[PDB]
Design a binder for this molecule. Structure first.
Ligand SMILES: *[C@@H]1O[C@H](CO)[C@@H](O[C@@H]2O[C@H](CO)[C@@H](O[C@@H]3O[C@H](CO[C@H]4O[C@H](CO)[C@@H](O)[C@H](O)[C@@H]4O)[C@@H](O)[C@H](O[C@H]4O[C@H](CO)[C@@H](O)[C@H](O)[C@@H]4O)[C@@H]3O)[C@H](O)[C@H]2NC(C)=O)[C@H](O)[C@H]1NC(C)=O
Ligand SMILES: *[C@@H]1O[C@H](CO)[C@@H](O[C@@H]2O[C@H](CO)[C@@H](O[C@@H]3O[C@H](CO[C@H]4O[C@H](CO)[C@@H](O)[C@H](O)[C@@H]4O)[C@@H](O)[C@H](O[C@H]4O[C@H](CO)[C@@H](O)[C@H](O)[C@@H]4O)[C@@H]3O)[C@H](O)[C@H]2NC(C)=O)[C@H](O)[C@H]1NC(C)=O
Ligand SMILES: *[C@@H]1O[C@H](CO)[C@@H](O[C@@H]2O[C@H](CO)[C@@H](O[C@@H]3O[C@H](CO[C@H]4O[C@H](CO)[C@@H](O)[C@H](O)[C@@H]4O)[C@@H](O)[C@H](O[C@H]4O[C@H](CO)[C@@H](O)[C@H](O)[C@@H]4O)[C@@H]3O)[C@H](O)[C@H]2NC(C)=O)[C@H](O)[C@H]1NC(C)=O
Ligand SMILES: CC(=O)N[C@@H]1[C@@H](O)[C@H](O[C@@H]2O[C@H](CO)[C@H](O)[C@H](O[C@]3(C(=O)O)C[C@H](O)[C@@H](NC(C)=O)[C@H]([C@H](O)[C@H](O)CO)O3)[C@H]2O)[C@@H](CO)O[C@H]1O
Ligand SMILES: CC(=O)N[C@@H]1[C@@H](O)[C@H](O[C@@H]2O[C@H](CO)[C@H](O)[C@H](O[C@]3(C(=O)O)C[C@H](O)[C@@H](NC(C)=O)[C@H]([C@H](O)[C@H](O)CO)O3)[C@H]2O)[C@@H](CO)O[C@H]1O
Ligand SMILES: CC(=O)N[C@@H]1[C@@H](O)[C@H](O[C@@H]2O[C@H](CO)[C@H](O)[C@H](O[C@]3(C(=O)O)C[C@H](O)[C@@H](NC(C)=O)[C@H]([C@H](O)[C@H](O)CO)O3)[C@H]2O)[C@@H](CO)O[C@H]1O
Ligand SMILES: *[C@@H]1O[C@H](CO)[C@@H](O[C@@H]2O[C@H](CO)[C@@H](O[C@@H]3O[C@H](CO)[C@@H](O)[C@H](O)[C@@H]3O)[C@H](O)[C@H]2NC(C)=O)[C@H](O)[C@H]1NC(C)=O
Ligand SMILES: *[C@H]1O[C@H](CO)[C@@H](O[C@@H]2O[C@H](CO)[C@@H](O[C@@H]3O[C@H](CO)[C@@H](O)[C@H](O)[C@@H]3O)[C@H](O)[C@H]2NC(C)=O)[C@H](O)[C@H]1NC(C)=O
Ligand SMILES: *[C@@H]1O[C@H](CO)[C@@H](O[C@@H]2O[C@H](CO)[C@@H](O)[C@H](O)[C@H]2NC(C)=O)[C@H](O)[C@H]1NC(C)=O
Ligand SMILES: *[C@@H]1O[C@H](CO)[C@@H](O[C@@H]2O[C@H](CO)[C@@H](O)[C@H](O)[C@H]2NC(C)=O)[C@H](O)[C@H]1NC(C)=O
Ligand SMILES: *[C@@H]1O[C@H](CO)[C@@H](O[C@@H]2O[C@H](CO)[C@@H](O)[C@H](O)[C@H]2NC(C)=O)[C@H](O)[C@H]1NC(C)=O
Ligand SMILES: *[C@@H]1O[C@H](CO)[C@@H](O[C@@H]2O[C@H](CO)[C@@H](O)[C@H](O)[C@H]2NC(C)=O)[C@H](O)[C@H]1NC(C)=O
Ligand SMILES: *[C@@H]1O[C@H](CO)[C@@H](O)[C@H](O)[C@H]1NC(C)=O
Ligand SMILES: *[C@@H]1O[C@H](CO)[C@@H](O)[C@H](O)[C@H]1NC(C)=O
Lengths: 319, 175, 175, 317, 175, 318
């Protein structure tokens, strides 16, 4: 013609997608992306972080030196996986404030043990039990030393151990609760024992309590476990006139990125930087709805399963 | 949206434009044609790329924390442990909901703005020589071949050159 | 606001418009008249309705939580319980304040946008047959009865029909 | 005329209201809505949730079996209301009182199941003038005060958990006032209580000494709990001072809680409860109280927030 | 910006304008001149001032709280205290980031808006008598002295007085 | 001419600044302001709040009455500053739940003490130690009264003390001797006990005999416990040996008071916010100095810089 028409416009697609704005509950855009990670990998990836399968062993069992946990003696981890099936198989015990010790040890990322030359004069050492079998014979926790009367004497034990290193030492010890007054006088001389574990700045005294408990693995007696952190320059002192379950050395505390997690999911050769009880997940999204329990470089856990971020204009097709 | 271009005076999108996000279609003395505008398209893409990285800093390494599942009931301490975690999750969940509504509103508005910006740009070039058909289309009152149309798209079009011709064609009429 | 229609070139609102939020007043060969625009009214209302529900999830049931009042001095644990609750309340307080500012800014801008869109819509139909008076008003250079006004606000108006009459009235002057 | 005029516009109101934006501290819009609930109903509504008025009784007293709390014997709740007038009337302490209270509050019941504990060689049902049931000396109904029978005090009693749920066992130890009283009530000069399961244990030693008179008594009883898991067994060992359990409480997982308030219960319906009473549900936020139960608005510091539900209001000159 | 005025159709800013934020430059029979527009300048600044006080309440007084640094390893309670602070810092860190981006966006957008509004205000005054050049400049088709330009800047410019003169000058042409 | 040209525009500045929006990572504006306080004042300002320099003393020692802390005897504070080179110089002790009592005392905001006329019949008072020197002579915590056998007796102490005021905090303890020989020598009975009670609560502590590492030449230890007596209630103390007795009470205040660990000096200036790094300015909403704060403080955040645009986009010539 003698004229011309020039039209302006924009693109559109066939596979539109609905998003949420401030103006509209649902509106069609050309493209959008998912902001919430919903699927896990079904497995835990062991590249990126040092992952340790606890298998039949809890973390505490592993550090105490329960016979069926022997393989863990020299183990270290970024993340320790505890399984439901885990069981204890040594002398029956309890730890007052069990969760804290589990937490402290978990953070330290190791159960490596350093033996020390303690002198226990006038007593017999290495007490064993049928409730704790190492392969064939009666045994006991490998990191503890059950002390009993030698001859017909249990002298008041007064032992010392100085911390001349530049790190904190963690000492694990315990006390034995016998089942009867007859048992209390047979293994130790005195009718009533006690253990006082002290430093220059702290102290704990535990009194044993005689009496029958439910039979566990043959025995009705019990041991209660306690801990002590000795600072560099300080000095561990143990005082006991009976019932002491002595330490054989110390654990080195480490300021680290280590932790512990409960999961029944398999461990596999794989790469991911984020771990949940359901398995490893992807990092690429800002949010996830898999699990509130996470370890590593993880997206933020939120209630919602899907969130769509628009990456294009409104999609307006032919009418 | 707020500018009333996309799904407004521009009736619909062109599914047959795979070339870009915004552009032109035209009929002249050489037939019909289509071309995309790369400056507008790029201006939109640049605002939409890395959009979330501007607000929420890249995911962070976190290690040992608190326990969030329990076997034994314990009372006070466990009550607190749960409440802390419950509180954190409800607040992040809110941040996420708000952020998506926010960024999406922004994305609709800026893409709608780029369409309006390109129309206005073209309108200001054509001056008196053209008519806003209310369609998103321009009635150009002179002979405009492909080179002439490209000059509109490049922004080199000189309206003075065509003014005289345009005034004739325009004012052919009156009763 | 950003478009400068409401409290801008449109000098004030009409207290005597109760049919809708946006609309028209006109003077013609049949006198004066008023009519609301329903699409604009609805366009805005639909964005204001359930505005908050797009951001805040429907309030959720909580049951046994922590203790928040105390009648005994305790130390460590109570400090923690108080801090946790204080942390929470301040964060939600921030949220509530930010959300209200955002949404209200959105409301003001989108309502101003609707007014401006309707103006442009009306303008694009009239083409050369009319004149922006700057008042939010249009000078229509031809006899336009009530049916012809209806023609404009229904969007069925044909400017070609009145073009020659419009030119004659427009170009009457010049000295 | 030969021409026409057409003007565009928007509506205004006479009853304008001020809101806050990002651009202005105060601007007038045609309409706004309150987002913060600050008004309470002034009462706790009996409906929707199951409300138990504690009246003169604390939750703890009601589960222990304090005589003046007998009416609560069989009660369950969604929410238990503890009044500030509440008093004890049976003298005890509970280490970690707050926890036990929490555990019971959450469980939502003080319904008790009696078991056949056998206590050979001791006399049962110890009573006290500090704890009157009706007219005569009595004691907590859920606890069993054991003393010397004849001239001796032998105790090694078992009780397995054959059920498929956890059992909560409330027990105690008696702290006498003088060495003279210890031996008179329980032959041994020094007693003990060892309550254990296969997985845990607690031993408590009685502390002899004079305390201030409470309801004519200078002695005390300290209270403890033990949770027994399905398949596990409860064992109680003692050579003196034991305040024996009479059975167990069933641990539930529920919506149940407890709340301190002096506001009255009334015939009414709401879904959210505060110490100030029930509050309305329709608003996102609320300024009544940080303590809530049910389907509640979020608690915030500010008492008013105005959400614009209309355009900028522009009346004439 | 979304209006395409600043760094859009207006090519660049004026460093030599120090009286205000938005204003005018002109050439006429009395040479060239520059003047600020105080009403536009004020409208921008009023929105920018106290911007943050609308969202964030005056800094909170806080006294005794919880311990946030530890010399001994304790396990469970220390884990909780650490986690609570971690959670709080991260949520505020997010708030701060979002708020800065949100408000900055608002600033860019409202300043751009004011430029456009002043342009539009000026265009509506000039009616048929002027020509939008796309430079952000108007070509006025009549002799317009400093008193005449002044009248545009105040908003008293009567376009009917120059209309005839403007029609003569404009329509001088035709092929 | 016969025409005019009127151009519209906006201002620009020579050197502009970069900010972040929702649209751009970096964009130049005419003017911006910092929103994060990252610089501290290097010292703790002595003004606005009331600052008490702990010097050589921990709060706990200032309240127990450690001889080298005698100067703190009548003191109250808004904020108590604990220095990292503080030390104990009295009898070696431990407080189970040290952290909580430190918090309670800190919050109350005073170590001011009120003497009460406790009668201790049959025992000798004012027990002294070489570990706790008052300048030159053997001494003991001023707020604590160490009781020992008189002549050849230690009768079961049964003392009472009503609270007729409209909460009193009592500090007391038990002494753990080093050997059995020492235990009997000081408090006849071979086994000691301390029962501190009220109408609503009670505590009993048995002493533990044994050697502990020498601290200032002593192997014995004191353990410190506290009790809160309510109005209308009554403190009772029963003991047949080993009691480290209270001398009176501390008044418990609901206060704006706290305690802070810092080694930064105290100086003459004015500020409303204190951190371990010293005082900070108050004018910004956020801060990156320290998560530990006291007073009117900006919210602590991870980022060290955030710029709020206060001008339009800056578009320089060409
Ligand atoms: C205080 O009260 C408690 C609770 O009643 C008593 O503890 C019980 O003591 C009895 C008697 O010793 C225990 O009974 C014994 O259990 C042993 C282990 O058996 C368990 O495992 C097997 C499977 O291998 C199951 O069949 C069984 O149910 C148990 O779970 C057995 O070694 C014993 O059986 C053997 O003994 C007889 C002779 O006695 C021999 O001919 C055989 O070799 C036979 O196999 C016996 O059954 C009982 O387990 C304890 N219960 C608890 C809960 O601890 C305390 O003894 C009591 N204390 C006092 C009075 O001081
Ligand atoms: C260690 O030290 C404490 C403190 O001194 C002793 O405990 C006090 O013991 C005495 C008696 O031994 C108690 O006094 C008795 O108790 C009642 C006091 O009640 C108060 O409140 C009532 C309200 O109901 C008021 O009416 C009253 O005025 C009191 O304020 C009195 O009712 C008793 O009177 C009865 O006994 C006397 C004989 O003593 C009879 O002749 C009368 O008829 C009457 O029935 C009496 O006064 C005192 O309350 C105890 N105080 C506390 C805090 O426990 C320990 O005994 C002591 N322990 C030792 C040495 O081992
Ligand atoms: C249980 O076991 C512990 C550990 O063995 C015993 O406690 C130790 O007891 C000894 C002797 O009583 C203490 O002896 C002290 O050590 C001195 C060494 O020099 C210095 O040592 C430290 C660190 O450098 C300094 O802080 C301190 O001031 C000393 O100057 C000895 O020299 C001292 O004893 C005396 O010896 C000299 C002769 O060599 C005499 O001339 C002096 O009179 C002097 O007093 C000094 O007091 C040792 O410190 C204790 N160790 C700890 C860790 O406390 C318990 O006695 C034991 N308990 C029992 C068996 O019940
Ligand atoms: C059916 C019957 O009457 N059988 C008895 C049987 O009781 C007894 O076995 C011993 O019983 C005593 C209880 O008085 C202990 O249970 C012994 O347990 C062992 C163990 O753990 O296996 C032996 C072990 O050498 C002991 N170790 C040490 C360091 O002392 C431990 C230890 O004393 C306890 O665990 C402390 O709680 O106990 C158990 O052998 C047999 C043989 O004596 O005689 C039958 O008549
Ligand atoms: C003024 C005067 O001479 N009064 C005495 C009066 O003390 C005495 O009453 C008895 O006093 C003893 C103290 O030795 C107890 O307080 C007795 O109290 C009861 C109780 O609590 O009611 C009696 C009850 O039967 C006891 N129950 C059991 C299971 O033993 C308890 C119990 O022993 C304590 O509570 C343990 O702490 O004590 C009270 O009867 C009377 C009668 O002898 O003589 C007056 O002359
Ligand atoms: C060479 C030599 O060994 N000479 C001894 C010398 O050891 C001894 O000194 C005393 O040793 C005993 C150990 O049983 C105490 O440690 C004494 O310490 C004091 C102290 O300074 O703290 C003396 C003080 O007067 C005591 N105060 C009271 C109220 O009893 C305390 C207190 O009993 C203990 O701390 C309790 O744990 O102990 C220390 O003087 C002297 C004793 O005269 O004899 C030489 O022959
Ligand atoms: C619409 O947009 C989405 C993204 O919002 C597009 O899908 C996604 O595209 C991204 C980026 O192009 C892909 O990321 C990839 O990252 C790896 C690095 O690990 C790199 O090697 C690849 O080259 C790529 O950049 C991502 O795979 C993809 N995501 C999904 C879930 O498919 C989509 O293609 C867009 N569609 C259209 C029509 O534009
Ligand atoms: C502007 O102000 C308020 C809020 O925008 C308007 O009042 C509210 O309007 C809602 C509409 O959703 C009404 O809700 C009603 O609820 C009842 C049940 O209680 C139901 O029967 C109705 O069908 C309806 O859904 C309600 O009247 C009211 N809500 C309030 C006050 O909380 C008001 O109408 C507006 N004013 C003007 C002049 O437009
Ligand atoms: C963990 O313990 C279980 C059960 O004790 C082990 O399973 C046993 O495997 C051995 C063969 O080596 C046999 O004694 C039995 O056939 C199995 N017993 C049962 C009950 O299944 C298992 O091997 C252990 N797992 C690890 C990783 O050491
Ligand atoms: C709760 O306790 C109050 C106060 O102790 C009881 O009210 C008393 O009731 C008696 C009747 O036995 C009246 O003679 C008194 O006047 C009341 N005392 C006071 C101080 O007012 C009330 O019985 C108890 N509540 C319930 C629900 O049983
Ligand atoms: C850029 O903006 C800053 C911050 O708004 C200006 O400094 C402020 O100026 C106001 C106006 O009088 C003063 O009241 C404040 O004291 C200042 N604010 C702060 C936070 O200190 C600054 O003057 C501006 N700079 C330029 C070059 O325009
Ligand atoms: C804090 O303790 C130090 C060291 O224990 C005290 O400094 C000593 O003071 C005396 C005089 O009072 C001097 O003779 C010593 O030389 C100082 N010793 C050292 C190592 O410097 C100091 O007095 C104490 N501080 C306060 C404020 O009392
Ligand atoms: C939409 O369809 C195209 C063409 O088949 C495809 O490449 C694109 O990935 C789709 N968009 C999605 C999956 O978001
Ligand atoms: C006047 O104002 C309010 C807006 O706040 C509106 O809801 C109401 O309907 C108006 N009229 C009245 C209360 O009569």
């Amino acid at each position: 013609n003698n004229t011309a028409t020039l039209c302006l416009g924009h693109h559109a697609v066939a596979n539109g997608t609905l998003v949420k704005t401030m103006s509209d509950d649902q509106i069609e855009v050309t493209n959008a992306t998912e902001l919430v990670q919903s699927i896990s990998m079904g497995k835990i990836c062991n590249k990126s972080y040092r992952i340790l399968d606890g298998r039949n062993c809890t973390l505490i069992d592993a550090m105490l030196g329960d016979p069926h946990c022997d393989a863990f003696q020299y183990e270290s981890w970024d993340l320790f996986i505890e399984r439901s099936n885990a069981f204890s198989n040594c002398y029956p015990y309890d730890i007052p404030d069990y969760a804290s010790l589990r937490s402290i040890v978990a953070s330290s990322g190791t159960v490596e043990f350093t033996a020390e030359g303690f002198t226990w004069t006038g007593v017999t050492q290495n007490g064993r039990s049928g409730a704790c079998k190492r392969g064939s014979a009666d045994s006991f926790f490998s990191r503890l030393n059950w002390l009993t009367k030698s001859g017909s004497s249990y002298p008041t034990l007064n032992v010392t151990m100085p911390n001349n290193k530049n790190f904190d030492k963690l000492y694990i010890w315990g006390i034995h609760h016998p089942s009867s007054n007859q048992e209390q006088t047979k293994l130790y001389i005195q009718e009533s024992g006690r253990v006082t574990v002290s430093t220059k700045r702290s102290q704990q005294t535990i009194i044993p309590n005689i009496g029958s408990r439910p039979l566990v693995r043959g025995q009705s007696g019990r041991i209660s476990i306690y801990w002590t952190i000795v600072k560099p320059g300080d000095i561990l002192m143990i005082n006991s006139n009976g019932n002491l379950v002595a330490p054989r050395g110390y654990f080195k505390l480490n300021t680290g990125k280590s932790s512990v997690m409960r999961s029944d999911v398999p461990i596999d050769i794989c790469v991911s930087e984020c771990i949940t009880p359901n398995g490893s997940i992807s990092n690429d999204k800002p949010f996830q709805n898999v699990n509130k329990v996470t370890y590593g470089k993880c997206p933020k856990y939120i209630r919602q399963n899907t969130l769509k971020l628009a990456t294009g204009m409104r999609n307006v097709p032919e009418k | 949206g707020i500018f009333g271009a996309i799904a407004g005076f521009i009736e619909n999108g062109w599914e047959g434009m795979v070339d870009g996000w915004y552009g032109f279609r035209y009929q002249n003395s050489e037939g019909t044609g289509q071309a995309a505008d790369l400056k507008s398209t790029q201006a939109a893409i640049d605002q939409i790329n890395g959009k979330l990285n501007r607000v929420i800093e890249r995911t962070n390494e976190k290690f040992h924390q608190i326990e969030k599942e329990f076997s034994e009931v314990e009372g006070r301490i466990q009550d607190l442990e749960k409440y802390v975690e419950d509180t954190k999750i409800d607040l992040w969940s809110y941040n996420a909901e708000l952020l998506v509504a926010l960024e999406n509103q922004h994305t609709i508005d800026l893409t709608d703005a780029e369409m309006n910006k390109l129309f206005e740009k073209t309108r200001r070039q054509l001056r008196e020589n053209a008519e806003d058909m209310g369609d998103g289309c321009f009635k150009i009152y002179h002979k405009c071949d492909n080179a002439c149309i490209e000059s509109i798209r490049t922004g080199t079009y000189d309206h003075y050159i065509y003014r005289d011709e345009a005034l004739n064609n325009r004012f052919q009429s009156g009763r």
